[PDB]
Amino acid sequence: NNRYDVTEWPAGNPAKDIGEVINSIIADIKARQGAADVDDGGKPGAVIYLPPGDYHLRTQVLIDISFLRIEGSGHGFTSSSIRFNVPEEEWPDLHELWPGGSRVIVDLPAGSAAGAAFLVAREGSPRISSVEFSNFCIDGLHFTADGSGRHPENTYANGKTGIHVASANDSFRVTDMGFVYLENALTIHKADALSIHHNFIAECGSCIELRGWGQASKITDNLVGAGPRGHSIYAENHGGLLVTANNVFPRGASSVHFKGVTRSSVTNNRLHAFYPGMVRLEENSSENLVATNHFLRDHEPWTPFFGVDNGLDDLTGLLSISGNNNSVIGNHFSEVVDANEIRPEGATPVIIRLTAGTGNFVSTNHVVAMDVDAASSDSAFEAQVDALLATEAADLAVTAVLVDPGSARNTILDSGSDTQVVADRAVNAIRATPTVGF
Amino acid sequence: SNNRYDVTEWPAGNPAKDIGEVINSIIADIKARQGAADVDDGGKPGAVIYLPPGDYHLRTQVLIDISFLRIEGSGHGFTSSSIRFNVPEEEWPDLHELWPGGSRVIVDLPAGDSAAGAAFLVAREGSPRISSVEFSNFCIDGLHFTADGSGRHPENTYANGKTGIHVASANDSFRVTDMGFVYLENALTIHKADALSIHHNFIAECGSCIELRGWGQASKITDNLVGAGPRGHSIYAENHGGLLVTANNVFPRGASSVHFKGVTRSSVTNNRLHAFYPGMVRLEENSSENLVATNHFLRDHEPWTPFFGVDNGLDDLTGLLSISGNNNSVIGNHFSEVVDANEIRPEGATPVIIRLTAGTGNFVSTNHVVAMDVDAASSDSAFEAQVDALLATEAADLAVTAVLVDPGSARNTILDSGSDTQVVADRAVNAIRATPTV
Amino acid sequence: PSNNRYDVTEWPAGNPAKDIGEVINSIIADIKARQGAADVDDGGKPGAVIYLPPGDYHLRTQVLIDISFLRIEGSGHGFTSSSIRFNVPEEEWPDLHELWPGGSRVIVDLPAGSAAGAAFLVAREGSPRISSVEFSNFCIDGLHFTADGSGRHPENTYANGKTGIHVASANDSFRVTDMGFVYLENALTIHKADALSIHHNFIAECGSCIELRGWGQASKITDNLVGAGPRGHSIYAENHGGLLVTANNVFPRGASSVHFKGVTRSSVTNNRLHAFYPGMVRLEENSSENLVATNHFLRDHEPWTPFFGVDNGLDDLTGLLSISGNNNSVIGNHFSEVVDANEIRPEGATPVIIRLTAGTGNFVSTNHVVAMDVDAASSDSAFEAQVDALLATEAADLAVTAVLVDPGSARNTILDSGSDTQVVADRAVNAIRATPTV
């Protein structure tokens, strides 16, 4: 009946090597489903079920058939980041130490496709289609030394990937997953009509990367947190991408990063970063809608990462655009920084920066900037919650919109006062937000 | 063994008579088997408990004190007990069915200490926080509402002291998805939530639906269908930062649609909100730096006879959206105010749509207010009354105050959200641009 | 069985390969025989779940669903592009890895009727309304399109008289989730819906995808991937109030992306919409008080030879967004109009983006229009040229009319949605603020 359970397969042992088990199942599917056109069918695929459990993967799973679903019964997330920064003598008193759910422990050596627990690859025609990953946990266990000289467990470096799709694909789904302690959670090349929906992708170096090219895809309703040298959501050479209803929290280098992305929408997300450069439209990213997002940029409050950042200064912008004919409408920006820590020394922080391109429409954006002392404490979630709720601050001067001379013929409306909008009025259409009074 | 249980395949007790006893027995088994936290990089992966479709009485509270527990069913099972209990009792035997169904947990607990009346209590102290508990695709039914001295018929009081799911302890990465809740005084109450997702549920005919209490961070409430009772909350949060509330369809008859106390740096964006009373969206007690964008607000009069004279106590000067806090952003919303002028309270008042009661720096831009003077048509048949009222747009104009800025609020910016007559505010101390008119 | 769980491959004497319709009807009869009493121990008709493992199932008898709380579920949406495959020369088929859709696949082998041609018919009259039926994560495939006198190749006609799911009766709290629909004249037709959720489906290569007929209220269509055919609807609703349409990625080639007739107090917000024809979003027949916000619209030319000269009959004066109704709100949308200037229809016309044909009090604000001139080009490549065309931004400017107000619409407000030249409207009876120019 094309239904498998990894705990009820005679070949191998999913505790020891679930990779071998799953590959054996896939070989069985292929052996049974050899003919493509028998009574209007023949290759319907299969479902592989992972009950809740701790499964070591020592052999990469190769998925090269369409319509394979791999499903579990728990996303299994717990903060290994918190646990590895608890003093080791206290570990025996903790209720648990590791992630759980339907848990795939990635025990591969470092790559980068070779370090992927699941590799989806098939060449030829048609494109591999409608593979589904649902409601299981992929755990890379540890981060290791890399010459950054953070403590090993804080480097976000292990060469491991959760799911890597190498080949052109159509109608794929990744839903309800948990990813933790992977250098790369989810990397999908050459995607068409993909949906990445309602996952929990956190404490990974990079979370979601859509590479090569793609079209007509969506990234929706995810909880996402990356590492300071990595991407939270990245896409390149995608057209018609929809990124919406995500809650992106620290500490990726950025929240959303586009290279050559066109005719797409980044709308209605909540985005929180500890560094500038939250949303980056780069390399001729054009005709995109960036609307009704909530941006917060503030200072890392947790001691283990307090001095760690992404190398970008406060002139970068929270939103940076290099490309034509984009639409930036109805966003909220909260810039909550220690004025003494602003870089370069004596700079006015920038919120929206247009570095290149023409015809960008920036309207009806509210910028709120305040000066607060940067505080540091060891207790992660208490420090995080307190910092979000603290509104004890002085108003801070900011540049709401900076139009560099290399970007022209833009339209900037109701997104700051005249002093807050730094731009050449002769070659841009600028309407300052109305001033208080008569 | 494989950590998968089915409540109809347990040796002891009877899930039809007391599923609580059965689930607790299962949890005891899980704990007995999963005693070690660090055996081969695992040891406490949790489990899944499956409820097939069926009618299960719960007489003992379920206590969940382990991480990575999933409780799942095969049907949200909603039917309108409210409609049924307002059908004359002598006609009940002729109806196709009476009760909710699906994978149905009937809450037969006495009133609580409201935690004591919860069918499912999630509580664990110490470290780490309990994490990644999942509730999926089952039905929780409080069966009846009871007399409370309100003067309403007993089944219309929204009172029984029962909760569906109560999370007492700090928690991380919890999920509540695909549920049905019905006839509970409180459907879902979660304290101290971090990175919680309440997604794609059906939460209706409950006194209060979703309450996020204590504090919280980085959570989301998405894609829900929600309807509460006139003394209760539809969506409530307190001391949350970075909450995302989006893509919900909130229908009557909660006291409010969305109610925030001390909520900061959050987004209430792209929801459909329908109320029968003023005070639909309330930002209270220093709720600051929030985005309230591209929501559709409808306020009209209750059309269903059993509740025609029942309300939330608030008059038409309250506002549909009321803000007490700093630096919020109210952008791109639609407000339909559809009321009978003779029913306006107090007598002869001009209804207010957006009210800023306190705070500075609020940015209110590009909001369309539509106000109509209609009749008060009522009907004994619920879905007929409701559908006919939504489709009726036959009406003369009603004068309203689109934006009221109280003297306790100043330094706000109000743009294209009403004509000068429609914006009641001190022009000396706020920045005001009237919507252009002809 | 006593626990209300059925698997179509385990049904005694049934053969779901030959006729899964007969199997499912037999299962429904079994459920009804066991669940005859509505009110025993506060229950009695909880419904059931029917599971379809991955496999190829022919349906030769229509399934009639006339019970509440029935869930039909599978383990794969199973989509592959039959459109691409049927346009690959037949001599190349042997080298293709697969030829057909898969997953949990229901092949609709019914003759043309339109409810008679539906694989699943949901019908029950009387009281209460049938409630909380759920369809989840399976595939419905109409197999072939057939000759219809249009002169297209048979497999390109989008004509076969088959429906996936047809709900004929008033319904409450229904769900359609995670499905795949392919090669059906009508995917999903739901009459008289209340509090329906159509969420996270893949609905493509169907003549029409989603149609909500009769009337309805308080429903939502969210997070779907949708592509229809040139004579049909992508998303259609009539006489609905309080409908939320959001987070959908609608791609070609429906006659429209979203079509409303008599729809009121609803929201079409935060979708990505791509069409090869004008008339992408149509608000018709007194569609009033709707919010159309922060959508991304792209209109360009079909690149794929088999459909290059096929269209929806509408000229470039139609508008991308057309409104006939009162008091709507069109806020924060992005429109990309990418067409061949030499081939605009009618000859000599200037394309229109937003058209108000009738009605009063429409508020159109803060919309960005981007128009460019690109030559139309045909080729047989079935995804490469589609990706390439989305990514290409290589063009001359094209003059368009951003907002056209016909004399039959008046008392509208048009702000920052075009230059004075781009807004064609009677200034005596409409309030116009031109986008500031440089």
From TrEMBL, chain A:
Pfam families: NosD. Its EC number is 4.2.2.17. Residues 152-297 form the Periplasmic copper-binding protein NosD beta helix domain. This is Inulin fructotransferase (DFA-I-forming). The keyword Lyase applies. It comes from the Bacteria. Keywords: Lyase. The keyword Transport does not apply. One of its GO terms (molecular function) is transferase activity.
Automatic annotation (TrEMBL), chain B:
It holds the Pfam family NosD. One of its GO terms (molecular function) is inulin fructotransferase (DFA-I-forming) activity. Its EC number is 4.2.2.17. This is Inulin fructotransferase (DFA-I-forming). Keywords: Lyase. Residues 154-299 form the Periplasmic copper-binding protein NosD beta helix domain. InterPro entries: NosD_dom (IPR007742), Pectin_lyas_fold (IPR012334), Pectin_lyase_fold/virulence (IPR011050).
